[PDB]
Amino acid sequence: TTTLAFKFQHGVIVAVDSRATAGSYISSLRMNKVIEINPYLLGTMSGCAADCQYWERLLAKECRLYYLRNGERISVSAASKLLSNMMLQYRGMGLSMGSMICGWDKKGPGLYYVDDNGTRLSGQMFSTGSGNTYAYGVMDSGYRQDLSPEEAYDLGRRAIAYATHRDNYSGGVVNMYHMKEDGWVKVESSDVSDLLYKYGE
Amino acid sequence: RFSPYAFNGGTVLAIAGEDFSIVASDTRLSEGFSIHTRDSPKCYKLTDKTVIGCSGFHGDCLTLTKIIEARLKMYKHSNNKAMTTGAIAAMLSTILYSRRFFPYYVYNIIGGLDEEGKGAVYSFDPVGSYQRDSFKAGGSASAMLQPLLDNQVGFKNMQNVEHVPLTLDRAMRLVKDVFISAAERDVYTGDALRICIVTKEGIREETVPLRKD
Amino acid sequence: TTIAGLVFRDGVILGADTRATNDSVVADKSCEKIHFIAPKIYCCGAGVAADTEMTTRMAASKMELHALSTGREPRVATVTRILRQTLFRYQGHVGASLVVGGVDLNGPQLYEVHPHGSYSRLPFTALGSGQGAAVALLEDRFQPNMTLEAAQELLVEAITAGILSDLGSGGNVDACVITAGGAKLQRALSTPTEPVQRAGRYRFAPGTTPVLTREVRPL
Amino acid sequence: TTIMAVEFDGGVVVGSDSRVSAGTAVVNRVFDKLSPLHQRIFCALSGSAADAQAIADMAAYQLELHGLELEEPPLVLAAANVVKNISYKYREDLLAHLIVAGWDQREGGQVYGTMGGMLIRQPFTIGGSGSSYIYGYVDAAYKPGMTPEECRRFTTNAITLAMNRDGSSGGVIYLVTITAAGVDHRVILGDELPKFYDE
Amino acid sequence: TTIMAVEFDGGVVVGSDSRVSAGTAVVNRVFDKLSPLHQRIFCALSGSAADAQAIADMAAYQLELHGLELEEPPLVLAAANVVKNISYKYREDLLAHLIVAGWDQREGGQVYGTMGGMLIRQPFTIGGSGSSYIYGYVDAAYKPGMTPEECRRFTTNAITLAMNRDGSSGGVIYLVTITAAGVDHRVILGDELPKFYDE
Amino acid sequence: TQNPMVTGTSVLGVKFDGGVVIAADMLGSYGSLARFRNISRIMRVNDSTMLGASGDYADFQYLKQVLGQMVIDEELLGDGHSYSPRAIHSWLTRAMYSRRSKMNPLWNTMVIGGYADGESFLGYVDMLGVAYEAPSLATGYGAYLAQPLLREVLEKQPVLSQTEARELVERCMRVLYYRDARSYNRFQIATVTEKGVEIEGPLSAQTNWDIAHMIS
Amino acid sequence: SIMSYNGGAVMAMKGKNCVAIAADRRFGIQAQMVTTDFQKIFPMGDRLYIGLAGLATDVQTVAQRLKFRLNLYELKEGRQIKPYTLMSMVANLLYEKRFGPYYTEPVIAGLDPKTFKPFICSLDLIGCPMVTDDFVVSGTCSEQMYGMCESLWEPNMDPEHLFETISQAMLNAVDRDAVSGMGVIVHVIEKDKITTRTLKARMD
Amino acid sequence: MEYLIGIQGPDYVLVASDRVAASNIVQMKDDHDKMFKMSEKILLLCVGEAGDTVQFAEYIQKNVQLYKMRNGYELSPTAAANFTRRNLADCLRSRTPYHVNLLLAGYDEHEGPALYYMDYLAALAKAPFAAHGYGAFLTLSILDRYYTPTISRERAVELLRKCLEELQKRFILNLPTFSVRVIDKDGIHNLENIAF
Amino acid sequence: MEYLIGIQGPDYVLVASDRVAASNIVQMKDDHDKMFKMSEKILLLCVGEAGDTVQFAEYIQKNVQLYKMRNGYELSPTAAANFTRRNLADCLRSRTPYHVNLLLAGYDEHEGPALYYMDYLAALAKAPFAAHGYGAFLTLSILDRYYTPTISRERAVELLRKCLEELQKRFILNLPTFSVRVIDKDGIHNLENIAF
Ligand SMILES: *[C@@](C)(CO)[C@](*)(O)[C@H](Cc1ccccc1)NC(=O)[C@H](Cc1ccc(OC)cc1)NC(=O)[C@H](C)NC(=O)CN1CCOCC1
Ligand SMILES: *[C@@](C)(CO)[C@](*)(O)[C@H](Cc1ccccc1)NC(=O)[C@H](Cc1ccc(OC)cc1)NC(=O)[C@H](C)NC(=O)CN1CCOCC1
Ligand SMILES: *[C@@](C)(CO)[C@](*)(O)[C@H](Cc1ccccc1)NC(=O)[C@H](Cc1ccc(OC)cc1)NC(=O)[C@H](C)NC(=O)CN1CCOCC1
Ligand SMILES: *[C@@](C)(CO)[C@](*)(O)[C@H](Cc1ccccc1)NC(=O)[C@H](Cc1ccc(OC)cc1)NC(=O)[C@H](C)NC(=O)CN1CCOCC1
Ligand SMILES: [Cl-]
Ligand SMILES: [Cl-]
Ligand SMILES: [Cl-]
Ligand SMILES: [Cl-]
Ligand SMILES: [Cl-]
Ligand SMILES: [Cl-]
Ligand SMILES: [Cl-]
Ligand SMILES: [Cl-]
Ligand SMILES: [Cl-]
Ligand SMILES: [Cl-]
Ligand SMILES: [Cl-]
Ligand SMILES: [Cl-]
Ligand SMILES: [K+]
Ligand SMILES: [K+]
Ligand SMILES: [K+]
Ligand SMILES: [K+]
Ligand SMILES: [K+]
Ligand SMILES: [K+]
Ligand SMILES: [K+]
């Protein structure tokens, strides 16, 4: 995998790759690594595939119950904390999952990174997966709080695409979301290699 | 010590069309350098709408198919209807994950129709990570079956081919061809090829002979 | 591999399949395993492919050189002792299981030699991963002083059994008959599997592959 | 393997089973483990097939030269000594026990054990994996001053009893009798094996 | 250990060596390995001393209760079954073979082997580390329909031959004879052991 | 069982017209040592299904008692129902996998022969739960030695008379004795038919050792 | 795996009086890719080529040491090398390192100088020769390449069609292997000419 | 863990190396040089095992120098790179192998500016740009993003700046100073060291 | 690998912690806080295993808070430190132990300023000054050199400065920002973060 998310003046954008690898072999190249929990919650996936799928769906299962119980929807802080606690119950058992939680609650735009270890931090920028270092490089070189929706779409697209070029285990397509005040809207599902040729003029 | 697993071979393939689903496999059951039986098809009818294909450790595949069978009955007594293709695929994911720390050494592929009558295929790993796709192969010869399907069904790496929709006839030959190729290279693939066709009419089985060496 | 040897009334007969495996994938469908040593001494090789190839070629190289220096019909017992002393020196690291058969002034002879350098002389034998299938057929149907054709059929059956029952065995059964008169290397004697015919055409009209760079060098 | 040698007045008797094994499989059900070292010196083979045979060859090589240099048939003592020396020099690398028995003019019929590189003369000797199951029998069934025919039965009986019990022993019984007059090689087949308690 | 049991008409004979060992040291040179389970059912002990003795106690416990509940002397079949069951239930945790032999009114004199948790009745049975060295002897020296005295000699001879060969066997031979009339316990001392070939 | 003690080698199975025939030698080995050369590795489950078992003998005797009681229990009800060969096969499969999944396996390979409703039954059961049906069956070294023979005959002649099956089985026991170091020359033949199960006494395969003179 | 470290894919195909050889252009260390224009096919003569898949060092080392021996052959002998002879020369070179082998499995494709005949072969990492009338494959995606070639290859292909077939076989097998790609290079060998092409392969 | 980087332009090669001499948890040196002068127009930047780097680098350095004395002219950047490749590859399947990762920058009067990348396994590759060390994982993407083969020296130093700023921000290790040198037609020019 | 430091004076406790959230080779965060508020006058600084630190620190944090609600007054810095010591020590000989190294700073209305050091083994020691992490090896000597028990806050911040400058100069890891807070009679005061 490669996975990225950053926030700016117009919300939070989220971009992932779509490659699934078994050993040295590409098992799936059209793998969905974003989970759309509610209209304004978003989860990314990295690590052991079945671990990610199950556990973030189990978070989604609980974010559902919270809304039906409290009748007021769940906060971003609550969700990412609940996932961290699920991870902590299975300590030192070999679960491999790296996830970022995105959303919009009363506190504004919420961005969170949750580990399989239990690690949980809030921030402006995060990147997970085997190609996170490449995604970071292009992100930082060309980031400012004063990005426009078009500039941010360019950056997140660029960051995954360039990461997938260097990373053996990243490829397929870029899947991008814009987290707006009134929920996320899915931006694009663009082929990675097509972009790399476009960026090569 | 003692190993709870054995490798028994077998490759399983599924392809989705407009109103049909195909699940195909070899009939070879093996262990080490010996063949257990030449008459072991991996396709299994679950409902009139859904068919499963299991490969890997046959002990796991047998017990798992029996779990699904029982779970299908449990659902229908409780819900007053048949478990849909998508529901079976969702249930299979959870069953496989309940064994995350002592997994079924198993490669499952689900083939059937969705609620709109359209063809649906679900590909799994031994631990329950799954998604829907147009075509997928699992098992010992899956890497042999995949690239040809990627090129012909996905139209990948081609410039001015007009992108013709997938027909039953064409997919049938495609299924036959990839297995004929795999039987020539994979030592665990051979004997016979069984194809299960899922349609609105139901399940029809077809058998084509393969290399017996 | 399945390889086998058989003694009959008028000479010896050697058998082999034609399959080679890299990992668990059939690399070669038509590789030759019955190797030339002398004009009337032949050797079947099982195990590490390159190892059975070099040992057998080395033995043949030493056997021609021996026949040149003596001016005599090479002895199969000479082949067997050269082979085993070479293999014993390498302490089984050269993975070559060999069935050597031929005709001497002392009549028809059949030996088997294992990678560690042990040997045995016998009327019938089988080596390789399909050896179990072949000895089964031999212990079942072998008789002393068989006719060439009765001996040729049993050997085919022994290799066939190996091909069909063993996953590391396939292709055609190769035979080599050695008589006090001469040697006939009947390559692809019997061929059980056939699938060359099909009905799937996968052609691509010149220009479907996208190209970025073209270069032509005139000759 | 099961191998055995017995001493009598005129010479010796040497017996063996006819099996070679790799794991649980038998690869040769009719193998003669009685290799000549000289004209009236034989040796009984056990252990690693390749290791044993290699020792047998070099022993037979040196005894041929030694025999010619002395212009006389090699002493059984001499024979045993050369096998003992190769076995000792490569005790970690060669893994085989060889019983050496024969006849010479100086000392008559003799039986020698060389396991691991030691040397001992015995009135009779057993060896191989199947020897474990017949230690009790040979101690009870032995008499000093047995006739050639009695020694022949004694070895046959003991090897039969071992082969039936031992999974690594099987096939036929190869017998050689070495005297002043020469070597008598005979084979005891399946129908001809002495019967005992089998349940 | 070496342990042995033989069946005759009126009952059975049970013999054992008298050694217990830890590594290369012997810690008890005079130990009786013939434990009563009931009045006319004995058992012969081998393997782990603690494991064996523990099985012997629980077997004797259950057979005492079983005997009282049926108000009749326990069947030898029943005895063998209870020892067999404990041995099977803890085959990984308990490491001992127990020969169970005795006499009852229903089936006379009987001999049972229970090694590893299986159950088999035999005309005679041997067990222990020293059993390996006497497999050939017992097969050759056995006759059906042996008198009590002959069976007594047969076990004595076989155990003597095993003890001399086996390093893990030594001491004296404990013999018990179980018939309808009762139990006769005798000891065969060092001066009284049958002589064979010793070289 | 973590480490098996007393084991039995290959069990044979092949179905003829109007029944099934099973073979297994009467040997129980302790490692390489032939310990018991006159013990039965075959049982009659009921009048329709029979069973020969490879591997650990104590595990076989345990399974022999559990299956024995199940048949007794069913005979007590006398409700016109009995276990079919397939039913016994299905139970055994479920038993082995269950034990295997608890990491405490019954160390056995099984061949189940049966006759019911005019159809012959032959089923294979592994210690890991591997189960299937085949016209011919051979466990352990039999799978490498006897199984090739059976298949080569059944290819040329799918239907065999009971006599033809018997002589084929005796021929296979000959190969097994020659080639398996963990085998013995005392064996039994079991047969299912319309009449029921018949286990035949101690048999020996005819051996020939004339190739012992063909080394000069 | 040791071969897995660097990855790579080499393939050869036969046609009507012609041969084709193809390789991926990737140079990468396990996790990352370093170079996009790495060479794996090397000309051992006009009309004779060797493609090398495996550990990048041994790929280069074998190519340089084979050239050493080839040039000496072509100087001592008065001729250009026949395809069978190169195969045997690579076989000897590799087998010499029997117990410390070069981690590369070479593919030889060419036309016999003088005689015209097409020749293809692949070899072990210890020098076992494989000669076929159709195709040979080597690399981390052997199984993928086998699946394509078996399904795609025909007995009498003209240069135009052969290029398309070997390309499509390489393109799609590489797209299933995570350690192969970054472009594909194809050499088509005819008597009159040699045609070299880099394809528009996936750059992910 | 150290860092090397090279950027090749149309007529020049820009190279940079960190100046840390680290042992366990301490920085022993602030001003250590990881560049070696082989010729007037060849630099060899070495990285890896502590004792092995300098010994190997100097051995190659002294032989390129030996060639110059023996022939009156220097090795071409290609011939140099291929020589150092041979020496490493020959020690690979030996009892003592060198765990060194290196970067050779040079200017040929015929071929022009050259940049060579080499594994510790001794695989050689020519590249328009390359970087060694864990920092490469964070900087190769920046390089991939803004590199054009027609980059000017003014823009190249600015591109290196962008890469080195990333190492300060995201890289866990402390590398505050770097050596910066340019090779061209006139030779090797020492440039203002970039400090943070 | 992280850094914690505490300096206790006559009437105040100065504490500082680095602000890096590191994963493998990257700095995920520049502004992460490793201080936990337990009371109005108790801070718990935690360091160690990634998932274990926050979970353990918050568990103790929530129980000190529970005590406040249940009793209307807060735990003494000593009682707090001894509570957290008990909880770690009880998990030591268990199936899952916490690999956390911590520093408790506090002000008692009776005893005064307090600084507690704790192992991952759960050994507790009261100290005039202490530091956690590999940086301690380089800074404990500086602290030993210039520390007097009568140090003023102005001089203590200057002493912390001297210690943090050493981490920039000699420590291999990149820790450019630190949290600095002082505990006294009036409570916890956020102080200008020290950046480099
Ligand atoms: C990139 C591609 C690098 O792996 C991503 O991390 C991707 C994550 C992802 C998340 C959701 C949906 C799709 C993809 N990861 C994988 O592709 C992942 C790699 C992985 C394998 C094993 C691990 O545990 C030590 C950690 C990561 N691949 C898988 O999860 C595959 C499908 N699963 C298996 O191979 C299952 N095994 C486990 C044991 O039984 C045998 C097979
Ligand atoms: C049958 C097919 C195997 O069941 C034969 O033994 C056959 C022998 C043969 C083949 C061609 C020509 C003459 C004789 N053996 C092979 O097919 C052999 C398989 C093998 C692989 C690894 C082994 O363990 C050391 C032993 C046997 N084929 C090969 O050697 C292939 C071509 N090469 C490899 O698999 C690579 N080896 C080289 C040796 O080191 C291990 C990897
Ligand atoms: C009886 C039958 C049981 O071994 C005899 O000892 C027999 C004696 C013999 C002597 C000369 C010629 C033929 C037979 N020995 C064997 O049959 C022998 C057993 C053995 C194998 C490995 C050993 O460890 C070094 C020791 C003894 N069998 C063989 O050597 C056969 C031909 N080959 C193999 O088993 C190959 N081995 C080599 C060593 O590593 C395991 C595989
Ligand atoms: C003969 C004498 C040699 O073993 C018999 O088997 C004898 C039988 C016996 C039974 C009941 C009462 C007395 C004697 N067994 C022993 O002498 C026995 C040897 C043995 C030890 C460990 C074994 O595996 C677990 C199997 C056999 N001796 C003992 O048990 C002595 C008293 N104690 C030890 O060996 C101490 N051991 C315990 C196991 O771990 C290593 C240290
Ligand atoms: Cl259609
Ligand atoms: Cl040779
Ligand atoms: Cl003796
Ligand atoms: Cl005492
Ligand atoms: Cl214990
Ligand atoms: Cl019985
Ligand atoms: Cl088994
Ligand atoms: Cl159950
Ligand atoms: Cl079936
Ligand atoms: Cl050279
Ligand atoms: Cl509280
Ligand atoms: Cl502790
Ligand atoms: K799930
Ligand atoms: K487990
Ligand atoms: K998978
Ligand atoms: K003693
Ligand atoms: K048998
Ligand atoms: K070079
Ligand atoms: K501890």
List all residues 6 or more positions away from D56 whose beta carbon is below 8 Å from its beta carbon: D35, D37, D43, D45, D98
Helix H or strand E encompassing B177: helix B168-185
Q: Which domain holds residue B168?
A: 1-213
What are the residues facing C34 on neighbouring strands? C44
Distance CA E12, CA E102 (A): 6
List all residues 6 or more positions away from I37 whose beta carbon is below 8 Å from its beta carbon: I43, I61, I188
How many residues comprise chain E?
199
Tell me which residue has tokens 């990855």. Answer: G7
Count Cβ neighbours within 10 Å for each residue of H158-187 and write b for 16 or more, e otherwise: ebbebbbbbbebbbbbbbbbbbbbbbbeee
* DSSP tag of G80: P
**Residue D38 Cβ < 6 Å to ligand 3:** no
Q: Is D179 an annotated catalytic residue?
A: no
What are the residues facing F196 on neighbouring strands? F193
Question: Within its chain, how far is the Cα of D108 from the centroid?
Answer: 17
Write out chain H residues lying below 8 Å of I134, CB-based: 25
DSSP for A175-188? EEEEEETTEEEEEE
Does residue H174 sit in helix, strand or coil? Answer: coil
Domains contained in chain D, CATH given: 1-199 (3.60.20.10)
> How many other CB atoms are there within 10 angstroms of residue G30's CB atom?
12
CB C195, CB B180: distance < 8 Å: yes
Does residue B134 sit in helix, strand or coil? Answer: coil
Distance CA E27, CA B62 (A): 55
DSSP for I132-159? ESTTHHHHHHHHHHH--TT--HHHHHHH
Residue E71, Cβ density class (10 Å: 0-12 exposed, 13-18 middle, ≥19 buried): exposed
> How many other CB atoms are there within 10 angstroms of residue D98's CB atom?
28
Instruction: Give the side-chain half-sphere CA count within 13 A for D177.
Output: 18
CA-closest candidate to residue F100, choices B102, E94, B35: B102
CB C99, CB C43: distance < 8 Å: yes
Count Cβ neighbours within 10 Å for each residue of A139-159 and write b for 16 or more, e otherwise: bbbbbeeebeeeebbebbbbb
Q: Probe ligand 2: pick from C25, C28, C43, C48, max atoms within 8 Å of CB?
A: C48
Instruction: Give the side-chain half-sphere CA count within 13 A for F41.
Output: 36
CA-closest candidate to residue D85, choices D64, D112, D125, D47: D112
Question: Within its chain, how far is the Cα of B166 from the centroid?
Answer: 19
Distance CA H76, CA H82 (A): 10
**Closest residue (by CA) to atom 7 of ligand 2?**
C1
A78 labelled binding-site residue: no
What's the farthest any 2 CA atoms get from each other in chain D? 56
CB G12, CB G131: distance < 8 Å: no
DSSP for C164-189? HHBTT--SPEEEEEEESS-EEEEEEE
Our CA-based measurement puts residue E162 at a distance from the nearest CA of chain D, in whole angstroms, of: 7
Q: Hey, of E111, E124, E129, E134, which one would you mutate to test binding to chain D, going by the most D CBs within 10 A of its CB? A: E134
Distance CA A1, CA A170 (A): 5
Does residue H134 sit in helix, strand or coil? Answer: coil
Closest CB from H25, H138, H174 relative to I174: H174
CA-closest candidate to residue I132, choices I15, I12, I9: I15
β-strands C25-28, E124-127 pairing: unpaired
Does residue E41 sit in helix, strand or coil? Answer: strand
Distance CA F99, CA I157 (A): 68
Please tell me what resolution, in angstroms, this structure has: 2.9
- The torsion of the CA quartet E18, E22, E27, E33, rounded to 10 degrees, works out to -30
CA-closest candidate to residue F49, choices F84, F14, F91, F13: F84
Total domain count, chain I: 1
CA-closest candidate to residue H149, choices H115, H175, H193: H115
CB I128, CB I147: distance < 8 Å: yes
Distance CA I107, CA I118 (A): 18
**What are the two backbone dihedrals, phi and then psi, of residue G156, each rounded to the nearest 5 degrees?**
-130, 80
Q: Which domain holds residue F139?
A: 1-216
CB I96, CB I133: distance < 8 Å: no
Helix residue ranges per DSSP H, chain C: 49-70, 76-89, 131-141, 148-165
> How many other CB atoms are there within 10 angstroms of residue I67's CB atom?
17
Total domain count, chain F: 1
Cβ separation of F61 and E119 shorter than 8 Å?
yes
Distance CA E121, CA E3 (A): 16
Cα separations in angstroms, B34 against C92, F89, F129, I189: 25, 22, 17, 76
Distance CA E32, CA H5 (A): 83
Does residue B206 sit in helix, strand or coil? Answer: strand
Domains contained in chain A, CATH given: 1-201 (3.60.20.10)
What are the residues facing G53 on neighbouring strands? G105
CA-closest candidate to residue E97, choices E196, E16, E9: E16
CB A168, CB G26: distance < 8 Å: no
Dihedral sign, Cα of residue I146, residue I147, residue I152, residue I155: positive
Amino acid symbol at F119: E
> How many other CB atoms are there within 10 angstroms of residue A181's CB atom?
10
Our CA-based measurement puts residue B48 at a distance from the nearest CA of chain F, in whole angstroms, of: 25
Q: What is the CATH number of the domain that holds G88?
A: 3.60.20.10
Q: What angle do CA H186, H187, H189 make, to 5 degrees?
A: 105
CB D147, CB D182: distance < 8 Å: no
CA-closest candidate to residue E79, choices E105, E54, E60: E60
What are the residues facing E25 on neighbouring strands? E22
Q: What is the CATH number of the domain that holds I90?
A: 3.60.20.10
> How many other CB atoms are there within 10 angstroms of residue I71's CB atom?
9
Does residue D8 sit in helix, strand or coil? Answer: coil
Q: What is the CATH number of the domain that holds C150?
A: 3.60.20.10
Q: What angle do CA B70, B74, B75 make, to 5 degrees?
A: 120
Tell me which residue has tokens 């956690």. Answer: I132
Question: Angle, nearest 10°, between helix axes G159-174 and G142-152?
Answer: 150
Distance CA C52, CA C48 (A): 6
Residue H149, Cβ density class (10 Å: 0-12 exposed, 13-18 middle, ≥19 buried): exposed
* DSSP tag of B165: P
Residue B3, Cβ density class (10 Å: 0-12 exposed, 13-18 middle, ≥19 buried): exposed
CB C139, CB F210: distance < 8 Å: no
Question: Within its chain, how far is the Cα of D184 from the centroid?
Answer: 14
Total domain count, chain B: 1
Helix residue ranges per DSSP H, chain F: 57-77, 85-101, 146-156, 162-179
Beta strands in I49-99 (DSSP E): none
What's the order of all strands across the beta sheet hosting H4-8?
H129-132, H4-8, H13-18, H177-184, H187-195
β-strands B135-139, G18-24 pairing: unpaired
> How many other CB atoms are there within 10 angstroms of residue F75's CB atom?
10
Q: What angle do CA A131, A136, A138 make, to 5 degrees?
A: 105
Q: What is the CATH number of the domain that holds F146?
A: 3.60.20.10
β-strands H112-118, H124-126 pairing: antiparallel
- The torsion of the CA quartet H22, H24, H25, H30, rounded to 10 degrees, works out to -10
Distance CA F145, CA F130 (A): 20
Q: Which chains have at least 3 CB atom pairs separated by less than 8 Å from chain I?
A: A, H
Q: Which two tokens stand for residue A77?
A: 């802080």
Q: Which two tokens stand for residue C11?
A: 């000479």
Question: Angle, nearest 10°, between helix axes C76-89 and C49-70?
Answer: 130
Q: What angle do CA B74, B77, B80 make, to 5 degrees?
A: 130
Q: Which domain holds residue H56?
A: 1-196
**Residue A31 Cβ < 6 Å to ligand 1:** yes
Amino acid symbol at E125: T
Does residue C212 sit in helix, strand or coil? Answer: strand
Q: How far is the CA of B102 from the centre of ligand 18 (A)?
A: 6
Tell me which residue has tokens 């009870």. Answer: D140
What are the residues facing C101 on neighbouring strands? C42, C110
Q: Probe ligand 3: pick from D16, D26, D48, max atoms within 8 Å of CB?
A: D48
List all residues 6 or more positions away from C163 whose beta carbon is below 8 Å from its beta carbon: B213, C2, C17, C19, C130, C169, C170, C171, C173, C192
Helix residue ranges per DSSP H, G77-187: 83-95, 142-152, 159-174
Q: Which two tokens stand for residue G119?
A: 């020749």
CB F136, CB F14: distance < 8 Å: yes
CB D45, CB D51: distance < 8 Å: no
Instruction: Give the side-chain half-sphere CA count within 13 A for E110.
Output: 22
Distance CA I74, CA I61 (A): 12
Cβ separation of H125 and G27 shorter than 8 Å?
yes
According to the entry, how was the structure determined? X-ray
Q: What angle do CA B156, B162, B163 make, to 5 degrees?
A: 50
Total domain count, chain C: 1
CB D140, CB D152: distance < 8 Å: no
How many residues comprise chain I?
196
Helices (H) and strands (E) in chain B, counts: 4, 12
Q: Which two tokens stand for residue E67?
A: 């005997």
* DSSP tag of B102: S
Cα separations in angstroms, A74 against A99, A100, D49, E138, G2: 18, 16, 77, 83, 50
List all residues 6 or more positions away from H165 whose beta carbon is below 8 Å from its beta carbon: H196
Q: Which two tokens stand for residue C182?
A: 């001469």
Distance CA C74, CA E85 (A): 67
Q: Hey, of F209, F214, F216, which one would you mutate to test binding to chain C, going by the most C CBs within 10 A of its CB? A: F214
Q: What angle do CA H77, G103, G15 make, to 5 degrees?
A: 95
Write out chain F residues lying below 8 Å of C143, CB-based: none
CA-closest candidate to residue F53, choices E118, E78, B66: E118
**What are the two backbone dihedrals, phi and then psi, of residue F9, each rounded to the nearest 5 degrees?**
-85, -150
CB E125, CB E29: distance < 8 Å: no
Q: What is the CATH number of the domain that holds B116?
A: 3.60.20.10
Helix H or strand E encompassing I23: strand I21-23
Total domain count, chain G: 1
Write out chain B residues lying below 8 Å of A22, CB-based: 125
Q: What angle do CA I168, I169, I175 make, to 5 degrees?
A: 15
Distance CA F176, CA F184 (A): 9
Instruction: Give the side-chain half-sphere CA count within 13 A for G105.
Output: 26
